CSV table of N, CA, C and O in Angstrom, one decimal:
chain,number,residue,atom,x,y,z
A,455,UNK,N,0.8,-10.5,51.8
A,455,UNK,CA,1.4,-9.2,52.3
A,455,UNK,C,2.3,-8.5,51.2
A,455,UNK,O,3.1,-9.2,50.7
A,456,UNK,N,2.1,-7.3,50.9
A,456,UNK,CA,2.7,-6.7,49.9
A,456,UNK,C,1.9,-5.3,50.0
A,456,UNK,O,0.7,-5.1,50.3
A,457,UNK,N,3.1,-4.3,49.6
A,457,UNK,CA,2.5,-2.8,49.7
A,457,UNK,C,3.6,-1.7,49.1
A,457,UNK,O,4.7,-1.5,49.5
A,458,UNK,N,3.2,-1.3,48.2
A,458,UNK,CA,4.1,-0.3,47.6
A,458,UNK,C,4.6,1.1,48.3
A,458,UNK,O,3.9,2.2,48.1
A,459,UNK,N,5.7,1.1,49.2
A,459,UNK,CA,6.2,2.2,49.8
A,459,UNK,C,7.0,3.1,49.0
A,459,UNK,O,7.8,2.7,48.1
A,460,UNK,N,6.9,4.3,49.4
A,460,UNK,CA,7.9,5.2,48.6
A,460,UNK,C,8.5,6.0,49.7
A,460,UNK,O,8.0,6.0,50.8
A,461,UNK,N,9.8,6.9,49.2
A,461,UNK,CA,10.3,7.8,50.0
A,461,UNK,C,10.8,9.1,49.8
A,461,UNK,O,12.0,9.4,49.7
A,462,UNK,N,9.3,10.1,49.7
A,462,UNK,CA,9.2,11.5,49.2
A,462,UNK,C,10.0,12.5,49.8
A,462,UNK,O,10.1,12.2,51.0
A,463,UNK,N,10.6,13.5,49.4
A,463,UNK,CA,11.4,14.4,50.0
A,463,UNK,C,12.0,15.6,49.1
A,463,UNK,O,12.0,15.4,47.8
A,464,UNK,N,12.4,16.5,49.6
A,464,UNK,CA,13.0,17.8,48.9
A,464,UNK,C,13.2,18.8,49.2
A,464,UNK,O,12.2,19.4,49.5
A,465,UNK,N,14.2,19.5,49.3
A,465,UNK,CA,14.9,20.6,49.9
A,465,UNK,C,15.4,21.1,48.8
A,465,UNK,O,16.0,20.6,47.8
A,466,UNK,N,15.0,22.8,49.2
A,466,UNK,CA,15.2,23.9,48.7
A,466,UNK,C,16.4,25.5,49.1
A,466,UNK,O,16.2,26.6,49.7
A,467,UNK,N,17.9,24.9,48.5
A,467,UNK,CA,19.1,25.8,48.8
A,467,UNK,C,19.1,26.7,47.8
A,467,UNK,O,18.4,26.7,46.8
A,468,UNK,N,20.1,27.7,48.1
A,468,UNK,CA,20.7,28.7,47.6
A,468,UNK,C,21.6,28.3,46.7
A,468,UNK,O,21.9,27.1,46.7
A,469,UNK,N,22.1,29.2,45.8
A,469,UNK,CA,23.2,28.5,44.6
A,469,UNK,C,23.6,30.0,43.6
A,469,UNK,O,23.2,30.4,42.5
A,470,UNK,N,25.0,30.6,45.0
A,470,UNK,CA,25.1,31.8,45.0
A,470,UNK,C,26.5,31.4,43.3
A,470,UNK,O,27.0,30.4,43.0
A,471,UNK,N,26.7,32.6,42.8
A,471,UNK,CA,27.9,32.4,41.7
A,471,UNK,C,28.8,33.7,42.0
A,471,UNK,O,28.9,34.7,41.3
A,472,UNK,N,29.5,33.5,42.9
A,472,UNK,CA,30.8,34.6,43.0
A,472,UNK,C,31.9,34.3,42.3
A,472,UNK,O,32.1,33.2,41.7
A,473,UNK,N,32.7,35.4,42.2
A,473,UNK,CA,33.7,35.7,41.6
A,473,UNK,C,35.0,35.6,42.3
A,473,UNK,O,35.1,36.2,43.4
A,474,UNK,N,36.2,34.7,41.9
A,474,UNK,CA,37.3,34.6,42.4
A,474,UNK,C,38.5,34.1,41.8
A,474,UNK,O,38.6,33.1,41.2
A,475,UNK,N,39.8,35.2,42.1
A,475,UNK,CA,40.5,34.2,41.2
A,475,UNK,C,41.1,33.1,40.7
A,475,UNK,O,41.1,32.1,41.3
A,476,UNK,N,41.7,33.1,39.6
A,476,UNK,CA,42.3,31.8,39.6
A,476,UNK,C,43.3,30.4,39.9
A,476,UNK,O,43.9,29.8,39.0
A,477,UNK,N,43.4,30.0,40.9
A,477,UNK,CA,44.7,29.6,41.9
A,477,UNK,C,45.0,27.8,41.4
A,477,UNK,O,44.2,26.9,41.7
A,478,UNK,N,46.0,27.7,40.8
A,478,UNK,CA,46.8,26.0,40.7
A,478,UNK,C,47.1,25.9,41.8
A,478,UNK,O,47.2,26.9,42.6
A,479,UNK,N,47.3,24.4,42.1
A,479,UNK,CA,48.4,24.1,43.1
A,479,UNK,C,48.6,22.5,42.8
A,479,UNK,O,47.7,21.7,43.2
A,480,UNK,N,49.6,22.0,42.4
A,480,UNK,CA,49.9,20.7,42.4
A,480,UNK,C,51.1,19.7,43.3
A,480,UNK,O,52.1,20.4,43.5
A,481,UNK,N,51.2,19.0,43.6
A,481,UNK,CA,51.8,18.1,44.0
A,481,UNK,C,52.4,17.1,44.0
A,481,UNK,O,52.6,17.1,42.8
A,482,UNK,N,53.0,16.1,44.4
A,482,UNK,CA,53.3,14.6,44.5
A,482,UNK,C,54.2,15.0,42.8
A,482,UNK,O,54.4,16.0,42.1
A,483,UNK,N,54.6,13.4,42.5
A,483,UNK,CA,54.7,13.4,41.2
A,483,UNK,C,54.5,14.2,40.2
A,483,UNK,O,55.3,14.6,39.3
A,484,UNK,N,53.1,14.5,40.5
A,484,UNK,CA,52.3,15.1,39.1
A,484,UNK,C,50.8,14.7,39.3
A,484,UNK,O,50.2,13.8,38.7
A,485,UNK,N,50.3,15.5,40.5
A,485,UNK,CA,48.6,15.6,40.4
A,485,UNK,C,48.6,17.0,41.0
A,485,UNK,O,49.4,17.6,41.7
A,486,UNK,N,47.1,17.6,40.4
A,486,UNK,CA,47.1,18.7,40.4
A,486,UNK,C,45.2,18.6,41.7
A,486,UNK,O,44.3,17.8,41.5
A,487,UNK,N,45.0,19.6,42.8
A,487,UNK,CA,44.3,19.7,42.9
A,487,UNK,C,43.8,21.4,43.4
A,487,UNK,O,44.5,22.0,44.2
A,488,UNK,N,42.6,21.8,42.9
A,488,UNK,CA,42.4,23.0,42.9
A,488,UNK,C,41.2,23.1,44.2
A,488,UNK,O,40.4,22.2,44.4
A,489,UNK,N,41.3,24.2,44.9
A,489,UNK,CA,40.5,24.6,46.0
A,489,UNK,C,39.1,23.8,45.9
A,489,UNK,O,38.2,24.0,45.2
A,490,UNK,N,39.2,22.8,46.8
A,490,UNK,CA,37.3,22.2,46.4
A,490,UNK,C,37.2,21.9,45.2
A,490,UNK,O,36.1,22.0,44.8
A,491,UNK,N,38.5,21.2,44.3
A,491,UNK,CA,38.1,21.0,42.9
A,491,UNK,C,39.1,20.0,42.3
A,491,UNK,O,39.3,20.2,41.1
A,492,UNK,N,39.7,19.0,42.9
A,492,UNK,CA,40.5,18.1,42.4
A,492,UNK,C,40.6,18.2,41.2
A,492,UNK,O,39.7,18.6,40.4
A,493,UNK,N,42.0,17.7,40.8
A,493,UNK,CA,41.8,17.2,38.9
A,493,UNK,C,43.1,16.0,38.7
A,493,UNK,O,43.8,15.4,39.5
A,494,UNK,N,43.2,16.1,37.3
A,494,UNK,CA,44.1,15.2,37.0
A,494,UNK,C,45.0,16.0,35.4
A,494,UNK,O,44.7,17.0,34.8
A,495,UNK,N,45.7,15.4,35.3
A,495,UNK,CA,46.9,15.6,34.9
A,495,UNK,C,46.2,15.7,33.5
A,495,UNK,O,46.7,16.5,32.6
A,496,UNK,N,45.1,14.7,33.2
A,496,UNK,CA,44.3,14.3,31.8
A,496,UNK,C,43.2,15.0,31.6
A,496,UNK,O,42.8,14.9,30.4
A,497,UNK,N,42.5,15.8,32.4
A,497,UNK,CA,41.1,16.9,32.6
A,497,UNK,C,41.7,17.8,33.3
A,497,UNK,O,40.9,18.1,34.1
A,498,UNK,N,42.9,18.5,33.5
A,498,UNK,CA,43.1,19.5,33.4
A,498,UNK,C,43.1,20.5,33.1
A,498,UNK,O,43.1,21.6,33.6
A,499,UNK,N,43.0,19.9,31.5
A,499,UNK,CA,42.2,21.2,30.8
A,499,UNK,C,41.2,21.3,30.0
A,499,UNK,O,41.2,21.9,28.9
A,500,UNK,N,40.2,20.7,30.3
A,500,UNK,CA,38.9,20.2,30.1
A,500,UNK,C,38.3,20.7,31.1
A,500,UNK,O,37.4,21.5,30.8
A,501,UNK,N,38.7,20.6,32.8
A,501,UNK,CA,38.3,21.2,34.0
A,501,UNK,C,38.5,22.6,34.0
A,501,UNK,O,37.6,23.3,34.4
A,502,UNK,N,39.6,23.1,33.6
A,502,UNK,CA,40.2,24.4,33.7
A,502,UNK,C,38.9,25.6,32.9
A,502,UNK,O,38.6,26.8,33.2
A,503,UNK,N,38.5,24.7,31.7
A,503,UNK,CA,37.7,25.3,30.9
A,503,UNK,C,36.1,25.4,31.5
A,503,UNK,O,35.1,26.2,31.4
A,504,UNK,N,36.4,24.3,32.1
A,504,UNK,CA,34.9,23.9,32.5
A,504,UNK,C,34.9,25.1,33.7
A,504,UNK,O,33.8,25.7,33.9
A,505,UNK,N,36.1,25.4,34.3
A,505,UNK,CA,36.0,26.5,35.5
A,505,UNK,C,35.8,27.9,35.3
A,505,UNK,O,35.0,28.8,35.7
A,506,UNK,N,36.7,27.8,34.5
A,506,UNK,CA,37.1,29.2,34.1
A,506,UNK,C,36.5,29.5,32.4
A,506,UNK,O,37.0,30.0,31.4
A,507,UNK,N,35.4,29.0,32.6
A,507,UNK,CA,34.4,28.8,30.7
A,507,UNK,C,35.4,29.1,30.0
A,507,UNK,O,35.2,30.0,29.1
A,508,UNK,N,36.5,28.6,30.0
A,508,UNK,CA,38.0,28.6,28.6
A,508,UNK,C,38.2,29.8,28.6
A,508,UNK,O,37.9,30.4,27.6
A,509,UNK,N,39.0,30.6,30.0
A,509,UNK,CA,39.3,32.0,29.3
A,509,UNK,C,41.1,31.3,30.4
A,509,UNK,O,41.4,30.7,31.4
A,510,UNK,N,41.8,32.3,29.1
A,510,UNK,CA,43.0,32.1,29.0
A,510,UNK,C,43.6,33.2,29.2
A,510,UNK,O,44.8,33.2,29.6
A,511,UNK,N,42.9,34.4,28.9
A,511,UNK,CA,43.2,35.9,29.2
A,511,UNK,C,43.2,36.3,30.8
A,511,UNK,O,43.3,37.5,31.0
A,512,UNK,N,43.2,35.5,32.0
A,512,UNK,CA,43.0,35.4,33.2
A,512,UNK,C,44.1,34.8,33.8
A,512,UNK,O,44.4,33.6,33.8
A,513,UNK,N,44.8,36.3,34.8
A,513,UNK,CA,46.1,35.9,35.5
A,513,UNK,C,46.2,34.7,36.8
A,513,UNK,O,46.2,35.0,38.0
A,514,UNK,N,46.3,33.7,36.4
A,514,UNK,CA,46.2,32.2,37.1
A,514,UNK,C,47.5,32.3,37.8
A,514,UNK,O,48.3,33.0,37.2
A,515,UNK,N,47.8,31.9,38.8
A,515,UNK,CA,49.0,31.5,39.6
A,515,UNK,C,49.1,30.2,39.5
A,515,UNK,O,48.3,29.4,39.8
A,516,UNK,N,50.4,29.9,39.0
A,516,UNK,CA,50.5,28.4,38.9
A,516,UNK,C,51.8,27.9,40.2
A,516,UNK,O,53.0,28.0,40.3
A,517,UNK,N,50.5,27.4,41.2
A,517,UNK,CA,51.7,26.9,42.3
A,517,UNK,C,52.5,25.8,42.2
A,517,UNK,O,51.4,25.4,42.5
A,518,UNK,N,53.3,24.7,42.1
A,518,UNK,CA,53.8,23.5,42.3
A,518,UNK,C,54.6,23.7,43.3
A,518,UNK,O,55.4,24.6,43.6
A,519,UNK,N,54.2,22.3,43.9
A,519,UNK,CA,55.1,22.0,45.3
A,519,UNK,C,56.5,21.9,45.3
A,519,UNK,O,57.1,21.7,44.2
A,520,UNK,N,56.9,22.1,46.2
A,520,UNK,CA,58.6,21.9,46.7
A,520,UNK,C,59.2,20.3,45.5
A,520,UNK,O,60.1,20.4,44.7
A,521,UNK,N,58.4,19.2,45.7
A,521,UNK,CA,58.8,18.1,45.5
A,521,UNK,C,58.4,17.8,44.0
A,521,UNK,O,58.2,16.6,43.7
A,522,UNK,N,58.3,18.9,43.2
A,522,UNK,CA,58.3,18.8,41.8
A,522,UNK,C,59.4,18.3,40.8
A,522,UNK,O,60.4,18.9,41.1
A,523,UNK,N,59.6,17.6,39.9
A,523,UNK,CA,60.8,17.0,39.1
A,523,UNK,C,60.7,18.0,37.9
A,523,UNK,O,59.8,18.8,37.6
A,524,UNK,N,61.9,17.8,37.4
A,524,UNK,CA,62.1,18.6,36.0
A,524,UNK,C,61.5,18.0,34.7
A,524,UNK,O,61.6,18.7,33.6
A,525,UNK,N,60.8,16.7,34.6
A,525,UNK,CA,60.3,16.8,33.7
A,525,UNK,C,58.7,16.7,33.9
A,525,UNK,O,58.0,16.3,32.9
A,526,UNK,N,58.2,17.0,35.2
A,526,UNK,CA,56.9,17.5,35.4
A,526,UNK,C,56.9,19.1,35.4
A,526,UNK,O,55.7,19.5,35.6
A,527,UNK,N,57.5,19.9,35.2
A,527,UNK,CA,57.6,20.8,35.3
A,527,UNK,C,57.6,21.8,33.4
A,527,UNK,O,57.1,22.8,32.9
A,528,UNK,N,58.4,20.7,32.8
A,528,UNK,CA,58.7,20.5,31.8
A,528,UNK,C,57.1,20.2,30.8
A,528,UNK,O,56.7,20.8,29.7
A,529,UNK,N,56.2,19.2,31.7
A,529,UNK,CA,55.6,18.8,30.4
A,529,UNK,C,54.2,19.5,31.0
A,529,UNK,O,53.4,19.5,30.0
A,530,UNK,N,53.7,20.2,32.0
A,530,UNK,CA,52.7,21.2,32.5
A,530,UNK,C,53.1,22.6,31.9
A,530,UNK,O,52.2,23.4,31.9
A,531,UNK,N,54.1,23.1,31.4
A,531,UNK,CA,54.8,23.9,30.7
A,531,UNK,C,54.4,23.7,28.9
A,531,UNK,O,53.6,24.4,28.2
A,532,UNK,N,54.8,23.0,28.8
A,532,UNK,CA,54.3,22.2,27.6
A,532,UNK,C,53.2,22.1,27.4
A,532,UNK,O,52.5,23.0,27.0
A,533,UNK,N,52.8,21.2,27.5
A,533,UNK,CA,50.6,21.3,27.8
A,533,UNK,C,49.9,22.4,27.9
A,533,UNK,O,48.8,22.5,27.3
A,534,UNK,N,50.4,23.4,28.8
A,534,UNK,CA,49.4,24.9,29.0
A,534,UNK,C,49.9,25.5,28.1
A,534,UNK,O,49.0,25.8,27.3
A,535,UNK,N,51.3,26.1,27.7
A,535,UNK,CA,51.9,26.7,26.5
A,535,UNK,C,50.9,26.2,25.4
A,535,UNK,O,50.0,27.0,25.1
A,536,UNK,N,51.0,25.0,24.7
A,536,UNK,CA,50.1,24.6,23.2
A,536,UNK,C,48.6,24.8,23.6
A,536,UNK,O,47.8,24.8,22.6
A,537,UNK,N,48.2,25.0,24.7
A,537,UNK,CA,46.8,24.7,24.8
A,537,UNK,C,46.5,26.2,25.4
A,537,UNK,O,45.5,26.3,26.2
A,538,UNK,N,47.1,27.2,25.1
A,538,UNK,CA,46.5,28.6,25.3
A,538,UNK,C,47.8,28.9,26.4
A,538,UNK,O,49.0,28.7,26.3
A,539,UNK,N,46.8,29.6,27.8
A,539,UNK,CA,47.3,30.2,28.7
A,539,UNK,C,49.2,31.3,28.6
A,539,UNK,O,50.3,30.9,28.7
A,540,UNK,N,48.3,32.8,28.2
A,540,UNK,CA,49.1,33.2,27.7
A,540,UNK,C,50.0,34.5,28.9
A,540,UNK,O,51.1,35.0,28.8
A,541,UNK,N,48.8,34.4,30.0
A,541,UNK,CA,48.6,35.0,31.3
A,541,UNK,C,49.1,34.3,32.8
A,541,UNK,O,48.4,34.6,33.8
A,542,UNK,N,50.1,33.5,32.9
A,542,UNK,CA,50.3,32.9,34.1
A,542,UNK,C,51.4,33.3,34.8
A,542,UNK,O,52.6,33.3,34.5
A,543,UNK,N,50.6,33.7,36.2
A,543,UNK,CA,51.5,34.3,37.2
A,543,UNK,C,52.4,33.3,37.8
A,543,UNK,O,52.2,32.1,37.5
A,544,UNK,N,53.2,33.5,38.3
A,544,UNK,CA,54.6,33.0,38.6
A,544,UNK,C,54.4,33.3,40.6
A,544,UNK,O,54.4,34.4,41.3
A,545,UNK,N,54.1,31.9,41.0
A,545,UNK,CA,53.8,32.5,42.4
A,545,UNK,C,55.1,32.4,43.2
A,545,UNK,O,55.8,31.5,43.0
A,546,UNK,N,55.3,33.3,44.1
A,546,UNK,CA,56.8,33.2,44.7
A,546,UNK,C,57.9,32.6,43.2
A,546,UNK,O,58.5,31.5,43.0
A,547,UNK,N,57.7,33.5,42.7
A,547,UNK,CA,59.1,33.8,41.4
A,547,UNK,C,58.8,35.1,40.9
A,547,UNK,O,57.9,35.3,40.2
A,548,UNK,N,59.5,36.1,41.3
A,548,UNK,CA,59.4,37.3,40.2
A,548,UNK,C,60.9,37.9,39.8
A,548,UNK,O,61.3,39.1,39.5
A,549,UNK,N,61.5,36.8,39.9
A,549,UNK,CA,63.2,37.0,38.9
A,549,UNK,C,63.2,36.6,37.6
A,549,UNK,O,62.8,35.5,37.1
A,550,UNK,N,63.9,37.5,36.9
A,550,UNK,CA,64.3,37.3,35.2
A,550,UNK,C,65.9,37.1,35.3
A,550,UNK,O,66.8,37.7,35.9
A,551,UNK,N,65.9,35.8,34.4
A,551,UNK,CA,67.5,35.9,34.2
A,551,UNK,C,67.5,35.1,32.5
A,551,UNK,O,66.8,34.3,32.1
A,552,UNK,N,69.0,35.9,31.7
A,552,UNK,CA,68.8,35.9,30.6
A,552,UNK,C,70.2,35.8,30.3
A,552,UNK,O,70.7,36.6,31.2
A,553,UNK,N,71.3,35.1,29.4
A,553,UNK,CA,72.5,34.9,28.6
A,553,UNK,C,72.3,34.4,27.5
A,553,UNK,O,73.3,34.3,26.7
């Protein structure tokens, strides 16, 4: 008894490419996840590029949660500053203060 079975199949979708813009939002500690697009703190910006094909000229809103620390705030600041992004909106913040 022996017989070689197989299991053929295949479906044919759509694979639309719209346009939308750029939205952060991070949490906890320090993990970042994007609409339908998780990431990490380490492919952040490897992902970011991979999303947005490395454009930096593109006003991103960078949200972080309530429960963010100052030196997570500090070193995502840090990290996007050296690594481009020269265009980031400030979501619920549009005050300047200066001494």
């Amino acid at each position: 008894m022996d017989v070689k079975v197989n299991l053929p199949a295949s479906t044919s979708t759509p694979q639309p490419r719209p346009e939308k813009p750029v939205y952060l939002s991070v949490k906890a500690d320090n993990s970042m996840f994007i609409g339908n697009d998780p990431v990490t703190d380490e492919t952040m910006i490897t992902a970011l590029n991979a999303l947005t094909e490395g454009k930096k000229d593109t006003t991103i809103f960078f949200r972080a949660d309530k429960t963010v620390d100052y030196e997570t705030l500090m070193k995502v600041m840090d990290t996007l500053h050296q690594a481009g992004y020269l265009k980031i909106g400030l979501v619920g913040e549009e005050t300047a203060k200066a001494k």
